[PDB]
Amino acid sequence: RVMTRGEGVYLWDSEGNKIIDGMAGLWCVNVGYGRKDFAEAARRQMEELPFYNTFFKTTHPAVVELSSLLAEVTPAGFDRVFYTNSGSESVDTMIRMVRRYWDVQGKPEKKTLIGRWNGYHGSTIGGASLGGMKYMHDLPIPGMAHIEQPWWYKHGKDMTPDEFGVVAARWLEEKILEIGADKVAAFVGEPIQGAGGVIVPPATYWPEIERICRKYDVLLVADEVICGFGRTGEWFGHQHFGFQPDLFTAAKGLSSGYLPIGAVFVGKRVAEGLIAGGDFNHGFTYSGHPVCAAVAHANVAALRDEGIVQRVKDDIGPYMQKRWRETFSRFEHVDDVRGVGMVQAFTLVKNKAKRELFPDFGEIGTLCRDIFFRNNLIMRACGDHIVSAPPLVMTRAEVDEMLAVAERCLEEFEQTLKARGLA
Amino acid sequence: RVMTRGEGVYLWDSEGNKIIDGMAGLWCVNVGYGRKDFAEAARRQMEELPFYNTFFKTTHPAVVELSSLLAEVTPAGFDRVFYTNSGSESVDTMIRMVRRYWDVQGKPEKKTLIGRWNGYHGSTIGGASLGGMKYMHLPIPGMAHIEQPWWYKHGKDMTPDEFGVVAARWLEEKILEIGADKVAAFVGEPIQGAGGVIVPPATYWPEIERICRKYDVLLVADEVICGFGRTGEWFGHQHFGFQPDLFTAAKGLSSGYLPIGAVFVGKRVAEGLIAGGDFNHGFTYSGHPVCAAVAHANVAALRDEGIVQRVKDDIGPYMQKRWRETFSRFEHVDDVRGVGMVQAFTLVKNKAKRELFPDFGEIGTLCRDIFFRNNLIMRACGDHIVSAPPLVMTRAEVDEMLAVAERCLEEFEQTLKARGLA
Numbered sequence: 013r014v015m016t017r018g019e020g021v022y023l024w025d026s027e028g029n030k031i032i033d034g035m036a037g038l039w040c041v042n043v044g045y046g047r048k049d050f051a052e053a054a055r056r057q058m059e060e061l062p063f064y065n066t067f068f069k070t071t072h073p074a075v076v077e078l079s080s081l082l083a084e085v086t087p088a089g090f091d092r093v094f095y096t097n098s099g100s101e102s103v104d105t106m107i108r109m110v111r112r113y114w115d116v117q118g119k120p121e122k123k124t125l126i127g128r129w130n131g132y133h134g135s136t137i138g139g140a141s142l143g144g145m146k147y148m149h150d151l152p153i154p155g156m157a158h159i160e161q162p163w164w165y166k167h168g169k170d171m172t173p174d175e176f177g178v179v180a181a182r183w184l185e186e187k188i189l190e191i192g193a194d195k196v197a198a199f200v201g202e203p204i205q206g207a208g209g210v211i212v213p214p215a216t217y218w219p220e221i222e223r224i225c226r227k228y229d230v231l232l233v234a235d236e237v238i239c240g241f242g243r244t245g246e247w248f249g250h251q252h253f254g255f256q257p258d259l260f261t262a263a264k265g266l267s268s269g270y271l272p273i274g275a276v277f278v279g280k281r282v283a284e285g286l287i288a289g290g291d292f293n294h295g296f297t298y299s300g301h302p303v304c305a306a307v308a309h310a311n312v313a314a315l316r317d318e319g320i321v322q323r324v325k326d327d328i329g330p331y332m333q334k335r336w337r338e339t340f341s342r343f344e345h346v347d348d349v350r351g352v353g354m355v356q357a358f359t360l361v362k363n364k365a366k367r368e369l370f371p372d373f374g375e376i377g378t379l380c381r382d383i384f385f386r387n388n389l390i391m392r393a394c395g396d397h398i399v400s401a402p403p404l405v406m407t408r409a410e411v412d413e414m415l416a417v418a419e420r421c422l423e424e425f426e427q428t429l430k431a432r433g434l435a
Numbered sequence: 436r437v438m439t440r441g442e443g444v445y446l447w448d449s450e451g452n453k454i455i456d457g458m459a460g461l462w463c464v465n466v467g468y469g470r471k472d473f474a475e476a477a478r479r480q481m482e483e484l485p486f487y488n489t490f491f492k493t494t495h496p497a498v499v500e501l502s503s504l505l506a507e508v509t510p511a512g513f514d515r516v517f518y519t520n521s522g523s524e525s526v527d528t529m530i531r532m533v534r535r536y537w538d539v540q541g542k543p544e545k546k547t548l549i550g551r552w553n554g555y556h557g558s559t560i561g562g563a564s565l566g567g568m569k570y571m572h573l574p575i576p577g578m579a580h581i582e583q584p585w586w587y588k589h590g591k592d593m594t595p596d597e598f599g600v601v602a603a604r605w606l607e608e609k610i611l612e613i614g615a616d617k618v619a620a621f622v623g624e625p626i627q628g629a630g631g632v633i634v635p636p637a638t639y640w641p642e643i644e645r646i647c648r649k650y651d652v653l654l655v656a657d658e659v660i661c662g663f664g665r666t667g668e669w670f671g672h673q674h675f676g677f678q679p680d681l682f683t684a685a686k687g688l689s690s691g692y693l694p695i696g697a698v699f700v701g702k703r704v705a706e707g708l709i710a711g712g713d714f715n716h717g718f719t720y721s722g723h724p725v726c727a728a729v730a731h732a733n734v735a736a737l738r739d740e741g742i743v744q745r746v747k748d749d750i751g752p753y754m755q756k757r758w759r760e761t762f763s764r765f766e767h768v769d770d771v772r773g774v775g776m777v778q779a780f781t782l783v784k785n786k787a788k789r790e791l792f793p794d795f796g797e798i799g800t801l802c803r804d805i806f807f808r809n810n811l812i813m814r815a816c817g818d819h820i821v822s823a824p825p826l827v828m829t830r831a832e833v834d835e836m837l838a839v840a841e842r843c844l845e846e847f848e849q850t851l852k853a854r855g856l857a
């Protein structure tokens with residue numbers, strides 16, 4: 013069984029089946045499939061000028077164009093961009109940048125980065141260490157610490173979500189104080205944890221994280237691997253949650269996955285420090301594969317000029333979120349129905365009233381995912397969390413089509429749970 | 436000044452000036468500039484099918500085609516390939532593979548990798564730690580380093596062959612110091628690239644290999660620069676006559692036209708990793724299809740247009756002879772060296788004394804600036820001057836490049852004298 017074609021939100025196979033890609037490839041095909049204009053952009057750039065050379069003191073014009081456009085859509089203060097080939101490379105570079113920044117400041121001890129259990133930051137040795145996947149962890153490398161994730165369903169006890177957000181953020185303060193602030197370089201997090209299961213923190217979480225980072229002279233880093241380029245309805249997830257990172261990382265969402273690329277966006281304060289040190293100046297000037305940059309430029313231009321991101325914020329996001337909640341909330345073994353913009357999720361649970369999870373977390377998720385897949389719907393299981401992140405161009409009719417298939421699948425899921433004595 | 440055009444071995448700028456690219460971009464534009472056929476391959480693959488979803492349990496056909504072609508040009512037994520987006524990612528993945536291999540074998544202590552001072556293995560935290568560049572230093576735990584086989588500096592009263600045995604024995608000494616049961620692998624570039632085209636003696640790699648096998652340590656070649664025909668063989672380890680357990684490749688796989696890299700995994704390590712399962716997803720689903728389509732066109736050209744064979748049989752030996760003929764006579768040039776289409780020399784204060792200039796790098800920069808003013812790109816690595824032009828360079832282009840370089844060296848010698856530095 014082989015894939016033949018993609019268009020919009022659909023994939024087709026050699027047997028003629030139409031498949032709804034409810035995950036937009038690897039959470040990244042934000043403009044959808046079938047952009048022949050991107051192929052033309054790549055073709056043109058490769059025929060004309062696919063290289064630049066450091067012999068010249070100038071930046072390749074395709075990269076200049078991309079950076080200029082990016083500046084218009086990123087938050088204030090992020091004019092300095094260091095391009096990479098992937099989100100994993102972006103995270104790795106960010107780690108080195110954070111540590112070098114503190115060296116330049118005359119604080120060589122300030123080297124520990126803090127992440128979270130169930131956080132994911134790619135697959136380099138550095139990124140895997142900063143991530144908090146139990147299986148991935150030798151690992152972690154030195155100068156890496158972790159705090160618990162803001163997963164209310166599991167850790168909330170009898171706290172309201174807002175109370176819990178403050179408590180979960182204060183775990184960062186506890187860890188900083190345990191290590192000593194003089195040894196802590198940065199806190200890094202995905203605005204919404206992606207691979208961990210679309211863990212959406214309470215509204216009080218990020219502002220308290222930021223208060224803590226600022227109090228203790230710790231840098232704040234957003235990993236926009238999944239939340240970037242319109243996924244939440246804002247251009248970047250940190251904008252939705254209302255925090256101001258000092259740097260943020262981006263992955264191939266920058267090109268909707270059509271060519272490999274990533275970036276580190278470096279805010280004014282950290283950029284000034286890095287440039288004083290000099291170690292990243294070559295990359296600030298010369299980074300960025302020009303062919304990948306031309307495609308990324310076409311992608312970002314489409315996201316803005318075709319109204320795609322604005323439509324997530326104003327139209328399809330709120331529609332998806334309401335329809336998602338209307339569809340899944342009634343099921344006996346579905347809880348914590350959640351989402352923002354065009355990322356959404358729920359958790360398969362043994363007992364909603366008790367907030368009791370199934371044992372062997374992941375086994376039931378796999379069972380449900382297999383039902384979706386049999387019905388030609390791609391949604392992903394992260395443990396027993398079911399997640400979705402379709403192309404942002406999905407229409408209201410396509411949302412409703414996807415939800416109708418998922419609804420049918422959940423009916424079968426509930427029936428199967430019962431039949432197997434697992435309900 | 437902005438770059439406007441490249442074709443073959445040349446770049447052009449907005450003033451109409453022709454620049455000789457004696458470094459093939461980042462040591463990687465092996466088929467040369469102006470391959471509009473590669474643009475068509477990218478266009479076709481991106482229009483037809485730039486994605487392949489894991490929902491299908493099959494590999495994208497572009498990637499299958501690339502792997503099938505690669506198997507024809509790699510040595511026997513490299514039946515598993517893990518694609519990445521760069522040489523840096525390849526090195527990082529290789530480190531994780533080596534360590535996981537020994538875990539699967541039930542030797543969880545066997546985790547230290549040994550590299551070399553002045554070795555370069557990319558810019559991830561892992562790769563920077565395995566590399567031995569004094570400024571980059573990190574290192575993360577489980578990384579150790581031995582001295583580089585740089586005879587001009589470290590050879591004392593030994594011949595190069597004698598020195599190669601001693602420099603390789605440094606690996607045995609390090610293994611014994613650490614304890615062999617803690618050592619996972621030795622990693623090296625067949626010729627150190629960024630370190631200055633340090634070409635080891637003929638006795639070196641065979642001894643390194645003997646030592647690795649004696650102590651049950653894996654042997655890894657980093658083919659970042661030597662890969663895809665640079666020495667006249669497809670891979671540098673072939674030229675030097677050793678058989679690594681895995682090797683890493685960078686964007687030379689596509690002549691740099693799109694970002695890509697790979698880890699080529701031999702039978703022993705692949706069978707161990709597959710038993711573990713950790714890399715199976717990558718072995719099956721890795722490789723961006725568009726980049727793979729371009730890499731396929733590149734590798735096909737390197738083979739079918741006879742480019743690699745021509746380096747071995749024809750243009751390589753011509754370059755090497757002409758390079759030595761051109762530079763050997765200069766008072767402040769020594770250790771003229773190279774193989775295939777990578778070559779170098781070192782600027783020195785006194786050849787008879789093997790005396791280097793102080794502040795190693797300052798004189799290299801002076802010489803490099805002269806080349807650049809004369810529209811010739813060759814790189815300085817400290818006071819080493821290095822060259823790695825596109826493999827398609829003709830004899831006329833070799834001689835054109837050398838004549839410019841020769842004129843530049845005459846100016847260099849005059850400038851040294853004038854500045855009181857000779």
Ligand SMILES: C[C@@H](C[C@@H](C[C@H](CCC(=O)O)C(=O)O)C(=O)O)C(=O)O
Pocket residue numbers: 095096097098100101102104105521522523524556557558559560685686
């Ligand atoms: C900074 C980054 C490396 C370059 C890629 C690199 C560039 C050259 C080098 O630094 O060795 C490569 O091609 O291997 C990137 O795009 O991110 C990383 O390793 O994290």
Ligand SMILES: C[C@@H](C[C@@H](C[C@H](CCC(=O)O)C(=O)O)C(=O)O)C(=O)O
Pocket residue numbers: 098099100101133134135136137263518519520521523524525527528
């Ligand atoms: C294994 C590698 C990462 C992937 C790239 C990665 C793939 C997805 C992931 O592993 O998170 C990315 O796109 O960020 C690679 O091509 O090498 C590395 O970290 O060295």
